[PDB]
Amino acid sequence: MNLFSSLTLVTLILLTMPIAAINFNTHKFTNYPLYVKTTISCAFITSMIPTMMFIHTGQEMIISNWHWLTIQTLKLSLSFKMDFFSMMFVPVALFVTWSIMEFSMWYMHSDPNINQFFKYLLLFLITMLILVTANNLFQLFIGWEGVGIMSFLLIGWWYGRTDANTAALQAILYNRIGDIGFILAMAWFLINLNTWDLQQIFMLNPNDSNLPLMGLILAATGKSAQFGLHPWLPSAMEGPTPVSALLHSSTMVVAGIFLLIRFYPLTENNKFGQSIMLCLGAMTTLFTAMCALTQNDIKKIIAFSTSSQLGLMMVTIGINQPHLAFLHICTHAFFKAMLFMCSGSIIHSLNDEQDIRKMGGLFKAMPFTTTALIIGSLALTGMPFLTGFYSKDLIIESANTSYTNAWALLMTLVATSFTAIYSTRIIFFALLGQPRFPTLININENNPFLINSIKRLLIGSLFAGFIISNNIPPMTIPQMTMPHYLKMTALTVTILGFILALEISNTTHYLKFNYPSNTFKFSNLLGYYPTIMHRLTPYMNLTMSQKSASSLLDLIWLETILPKTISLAQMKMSTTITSQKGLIKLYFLSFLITILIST
Amino acid sequence: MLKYIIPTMMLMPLTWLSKNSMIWINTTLHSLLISLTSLLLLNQFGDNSLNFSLTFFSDSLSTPLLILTMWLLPLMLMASQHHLSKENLARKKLFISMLILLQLFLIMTFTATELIFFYIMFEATLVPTLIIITRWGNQTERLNAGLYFLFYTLAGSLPLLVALIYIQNTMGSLNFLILQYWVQPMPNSWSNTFMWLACMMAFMVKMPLYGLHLWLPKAHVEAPIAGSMVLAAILLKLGGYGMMRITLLLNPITDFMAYPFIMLSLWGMIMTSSICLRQTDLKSLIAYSSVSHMALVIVAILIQTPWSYMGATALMIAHGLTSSMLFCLANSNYERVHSRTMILARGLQTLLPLMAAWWLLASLTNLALPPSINLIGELFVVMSTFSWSNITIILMGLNMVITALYSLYMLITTQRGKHTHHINNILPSFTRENALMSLHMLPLLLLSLNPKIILGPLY
Amino acid sequence: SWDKDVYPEPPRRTPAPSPQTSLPNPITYLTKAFDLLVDRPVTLVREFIERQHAKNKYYYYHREFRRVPDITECHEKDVLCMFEAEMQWKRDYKVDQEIVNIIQERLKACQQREGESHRQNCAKELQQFTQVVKAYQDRYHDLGAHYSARKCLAKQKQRMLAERKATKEAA
Amino acid sequence: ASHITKDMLPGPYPKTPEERAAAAKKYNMRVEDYEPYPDDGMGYGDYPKLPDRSQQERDPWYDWDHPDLRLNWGEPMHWDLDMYIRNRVDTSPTPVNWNLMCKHLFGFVAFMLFMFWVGETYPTYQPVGPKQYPYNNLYLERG
Amino acid sequence: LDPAEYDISSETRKAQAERLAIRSRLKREYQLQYNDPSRRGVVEDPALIRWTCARSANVYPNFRPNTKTSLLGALFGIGPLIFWYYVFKTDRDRKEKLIQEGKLDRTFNISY
Amino acid sequence: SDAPPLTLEGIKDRVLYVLKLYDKIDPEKLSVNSHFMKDLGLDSLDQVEIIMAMEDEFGFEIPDIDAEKLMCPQEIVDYIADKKDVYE
Amino acid sequence: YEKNPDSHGYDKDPAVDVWNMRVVFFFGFSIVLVLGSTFVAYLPDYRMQEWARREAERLVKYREAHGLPLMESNCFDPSKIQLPED
Amino acid sequence: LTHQQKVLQLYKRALRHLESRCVHRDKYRYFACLLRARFDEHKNEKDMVKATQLLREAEKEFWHGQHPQPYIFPESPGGTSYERYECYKVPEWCLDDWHPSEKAMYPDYFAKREQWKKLRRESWEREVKQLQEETPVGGPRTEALPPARKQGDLPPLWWHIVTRPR
């Protein structure tokens, strides 16, 4: 049973590195980045054992270690919460980061700051792990703002390039609104439940969970990219590619909904909650479908795709199917991590243009990366029968049925379809036409770092979703009796949009002069510029009102010194005349004997 | 306590009689040796506040604040050098003497039992600071912002003596222990009005509430770095402290009387938090920051939940170290290029690659990062205020977002984005700078392990 | 070796392992090997430290506090009695605090033990929880920053009077 | 040194406009610029006599090393630089569309019209007379 | 914003605007352009000092003649503020009511 | 890495190469000194084209103001030579 | 603008600097941080709360074992108290 | 500002937006050819006002041809680079002070660097003389920097020898 004490070993196996990154200050020059990588794998196998132990006997034991202060009636310590959410997730996180770190050893080899870079990226991983293993909601909060500020630093990896650090600042801003929601949920849990302890909140189910759980909706929408707050991703591209990979797959934007999954028994009820869920995750699916197309930076396409995914997962928290979502988070991590970590092969291999215009055809000394792009593309299409199918298709089957408000069904359909048409875009451009781009081919695929990275990630991917497939101890009744026309539409929509977009950008006739109004609203009628610029001016307006209270404050104090200016007149009321104060003090002195005569 | 009063008083002639060039060594040394016993001061236990002597005692809150003071002298004095490092000896011994005497009256104030001894030692604390910042403040036109600054204090700060002496002859003893157990309810009417308002506004002038906050910025831009770490790490916590104690009485009154001030602090938290976003001249940013956190403190004081105090005091200490340090960063940047204006230079991730870590680390500790004591205190305060009004979290968390924005904006455009390349002066770091930064953060990060020292009397 | 009936450990109810199919032994190789590698090499050390401790014993005592008249027998003023009363009031208070901690932890461990059964077997302990926390809720809850005895005794006066009118309207 | 006149107070009529042209931009429309400072000032709103400018984009275009974004030039700073550079928008033609977004909110309110109405479970929907819906309603009998 | 009308520039505006504008400019470009050895410290340019001093609010302490000013400031701190006074006092008193009567359904509240 | 730099030999071979691919004038006279307009009398709009497609050869920079006055090939090689990092 | 030639370099003018960093790094980093941090790390039980745990355990065990309902509210026995009258 | 760069700019960025329009580069070709004729019929008339007029018409008709994300080659300001490496540029006045140990870490660099320090320490008087001589009163008219006639350096050189891009 104490092999789960080895599970609380692996976290310190991760803890080990930064200590090496500080104390010795020389042998790090020996290529520790390799060393960090090895620590990640050690955490992968040593983290793999507990999963097996669980999936035979279950047996999830929470440990409190030594308690954190006391205060009044609630002693909050810290914990590591083995939920099978943690048990199953952490090997995925460590695995994908194994990939991204080896790939990074290929990506940053020129950068002189590489060591520091791994210090960060690793530390980011620590914040994730400590988030997804925690129950006690204060420790959640810790991992929450930890991964947040780590997003700030990593997206801000490049000092200078005002664009970059600016994007970073917008990101951390949105995280902080998600925070206001989160600490709302915390406070409510105090006053009403006299704790935040993720066990105790589960035990006593509040009759009224409305307000706090709404707060949880907000906190989820902050990080998760959800609607009403978009701009996170597309400017979050400004970070270096590997950081972007790790950012959209295993961490952050998934850790937004990971909280809602964490509280799932509390969101079982208040159909107000599921209502808002599918009222919103929907809006991100079709919204990002409407605003995603035609923007020509490959990395950015990948971004908006992950946004649409996240929408679909929010919808999966809709109704009640939290586990299906959870599985789709893991699978999604594999697939899109693959997709980025290949797109870097494209970019850096090309020099770097990273625009979908130019680019070229599929196979030009690029066999393995393109293979990764139709494994990952063909993958993220919704799969025909492949791994992620075990997520997305089940998702649209159950969501396709029962009590959904039904505005979400069409949402699912055209959503997934436009995902497929993203794929058709990146193939019909990056993989299709004979090469057109800046000449002097520099391209190289030859290096064990990439091939080994993408290698392991794809070998795993196709075989990982299959292990996750039927090791998922059954948590509910699957539909599994699926009616005609409510069954046959899963794959079928992916083929209707597959064919439709196919003929859209295939056999294109003369293209010149005008384009549509929708293409100008496909980039957008600003949801980026309107909110960022508009919402940027308002605080300055409040600085003008601040000049009103400040100028009125020193204008009132200037009314006291103006009362000291004309109070000097109360001194200057003296006429300095000996016939004035002498004889007036004599007359008014006889008026002191007049007032003293009657006083 | 007297064992802490002698050693500094002896630390005065240590300064005065000494060979030239050893004054900093002697003072720093023996002052840290004081700090050890300041750390001895914690016996505090159980229920009764320890009482050293019938004249002055210590409960919890006085103990953390005091430890912070006696810890803060050696770091302060340590920091003040090289601001000058050229003068006649008399200037040096005069300045160190003044810092000493100031510390003495501070210890008097925090330890003081009886509120009149507290008050005498109160203005007696204000004078030495004034002499510091005015006699040499780098004096931009001098603003005369020390002197009528002392008028900002005394203007409405004198009548609290009146109200006190009233409390004296009505109830007899002004000993705080016996003012406790004898406190009797005071109904809401017009006499209790002018009284409550007297004491309240009297201390509220010190921790600036948004109405009076014009007090700080000028006084704190004109201050030499020693006078700054004096000012905003401590001299506000005096007002908030005495506030903590004299709110013992005024029991029902503070409700109907509190409400307007609470409103003003909840709005001014956001306002000040805004105006500090857009300004130039870095030295002001951290000032208005102090105004913001102190507004949050007042909010915590008036609502009387114990949570409110725990988070409150935690915010006193954490904001003390954080704000203090961050000032000292502004100064360490100022000696490099003579500006005070933020936007002037930039870069310093390239250059001074270490000084980054202290900028980052400190700014994060003012960003309310979860394990940091600043977020412990701020967090409990937000809990209390949400308990008081379910609605106020819009304003509170909105301060969370703004404080995030400027606190992380300072971290940039001083420290990042380009080197202005017409500079060619800045000399890489120092060992002293690293010593100062370290002596600030390292305890602020360690306290994030065993905080139960710094949480308030109620715990 | 904590006091057992304070912190219940229910029956362990461990199931009997059935192989049920003939395959490799994926964890058990490493549960035995672990119990070879990490069990004894630590166990020797903990035991050695044990005997090292045991060669020289210590005795440290849990303190006691006697009782006093508390708030009643003190006159309206003349603190010299009051100080004892109200400070020990504060002690007993913190004691009640830690009682609340104990119950509140029993509930958590209860749900974690049950598993998916959340409303089955925690009913008793949750019940006594609502009992105690309603007691604390009634007594100490709303007083304020500055509280000693006078205010607790005060609130108790308040409830006694409100319930005395409530029991005249009981007629 | 900081000269006796480094800035500010306007309002002397005849030669102060040219004086403000000095120490700042000086030209025909620049005399009208220092003048535009005292015209924008008008009755005192806490703005001193510092010169004026517009919000248009002078931005990075590769030559001339323009204003305070990257400063090789010593001309006036206007009032902007605390707004522009790092985080801002300033000037462009812009789409200026308040419809499309609010007409996605059209999608939302369309939903909330779908909110009281519903899709159902099985198999199909809207023959409806007063048909059943889930609550299972009348009687029970068979035999 | 949106360069338009493609101004014909006339004659004066050509001669005046060109010659005078780039006149003063190149004067100051070459001015700070010296960039010799032997300067250790900052280049100190009198620009942006005017920025700082003016943005320190030079007209703040003097006065604020009425005009529309007291209306913009007073109404600027009027409508939202005092209304928030009224709403926190409102919800305050409501909270006190539902505590003192009926039920707020606090049940276990405790730490507060 | 993105290893290969553009050296003087290389860039020479490139500007030279593409200008030899320009059809409307012949490889007959092409030399770094050979005048980029006066010799060939090419349209100035057409030199805007040359700098266009040559920028699309090397893919960077070339602001309009500096692109205006370029002319002779050796000069173009020079601009790319200081803008890129070229000399030994 | 005095700067230093930066012959080595530190706090103050030469040859006393080494002693300066020695006293400030030693008394500042060594003694108070490490020593003090061990002091307040574990000092005697602070605020008595450990004692509170023990006492709580004993008292609760007694309260169940003797059948009394624990935590009776009423901080003072109404058996001894008096009430004002209308 | 002259008709030259006005027309030529509109032509150039017109080709740019046209690049961003189409794909496979051939359709871009013969479309760009139709445009080549569209400006090719032009330019043969020295009539004054007619021309600028028709140009402005091409300014609106061009402004229609802008889709919001025109292709931007990486190095200029744009979503790819514009100083990705900017944290790597350390000015040569830094390293003027390193520790004499590390100043001995690379013994032969500072040799030649010292030949530069003397190159431009011996200089700047020749510079100031030549400049103070040449400048017309105020130096208003010229943003340029004319060379040196005598054998030696070009006078305002120092910053123009730069830290290079990466």
From Swiss-Prot, chain A:
The chain crosses the membrane at residues 4-24, 43-63, 84-104, 114-134, 140-160, 171-191, 213-233, 241-261, 272-292, 301-320, 325-347, 366-386, 413-433, 457-477, 485-505, 582-599. It catalyses: a ubiquinone + NADH + 5 H(+)(in) = a ubiquinol + NAD(+) + 4 H(+)(out). GO terms for molecular function: NADH dehydrogenase (ubiquinone) activity. Its EC number is 7.1.1.2. PANTHER family: NADH-UBIQUINONE OXIDOREDUCTASE CHAIN 5. GO terms for biological process: electron transport coupled proton transport; mitochondrial electron transport, NADH to ubiquinone; mitochondrial respiratory chain complex I assembly. It is a multi-pass membrane protein. It is found in: Mitochondrion inner membrane. One of its GO terms (cellular component) is respiratory chain complex I. It comes from the Eukaryota. Belongs to the complex I subunit 5 family. Keywords: Electron transport, Membrane, Mitochondrion, Mitochondrion inner membrane, NAD, Respiratory chain, Translocase, Transmembrane, Transmembrane helix, Transport, Ubiquinone. Core subunit of the mitochondrial membrane respiratory chain NADH dehydrogenase (Complex I) which catalyzes electron transfer from NADH through the respiratory chain, using ubiquinone as an electron acceptor. Essential for the catalytic activity and assembly of complex I. This is NADH-ubiquinone oxidoreductase chain 5. Pfam families: NADH5_C (PF06455), Proton_antipo_M (PF00361), Proton_antipo_N (PF00662). Core subunit of respiratory chain NADH dehydrogenase (Complex I) which is composed of 45 different subunits. The keyword Lipid metabolism does not apply.
Swiss-Prot record, chain B:
This is NADH-ubiquinone oxidoreductase chain 4. The gene is MT-ND4. It is an enzyme of class 7 (translocase). Keywords: Electron transport, Membrane, Mitochondrion, Mitochondrion inner membrane, NAD, Respiratory chain, Translocase, Transmembrane, Transmembrane helix, Transport, Ubiquinone. The keyword rRNA-binding does not apply. It catalyses: a ubiquinone + NADH + 5 H(+)(in) = a ubiquinol + NAD(+) + 4 H(+)(out). Core subunit of the mitochondrial membrane respiratory chain NADH dehydrogenase (Complex I) which catalyzes electron transfer from NADH through the respiratory chain, using ubiquinone as an electron acceptor. Essential for the catalytic activity and assembly of complex I. Its EC number is 7.1.1.2. It is found in: Mitochondrion inner membrane. The chain crosses the membrane at residues 22-42, 60-80, 98-118, 147-167, 196-216, 224-244, 256-276, 284-303, 308-330, 351-371, 391-411. One of its GO terms (biological process) is mitochondrial electron transport, NADH to ubiquinone. Core subunit of respiratory chain NADH dehydrogenase (Complex I) which is composed of 45 different subunits. Its main location: mitochondrion. GO terms for molecular function: NADH dehydrogenase (ubiquinone) activity; ubiquinone binding. It is a multi-pass membrane protein. Belongs to the complex I subunit 4 family. GO terms for cellular component: mitochondrial inner membrane; respiratory chain complex I.
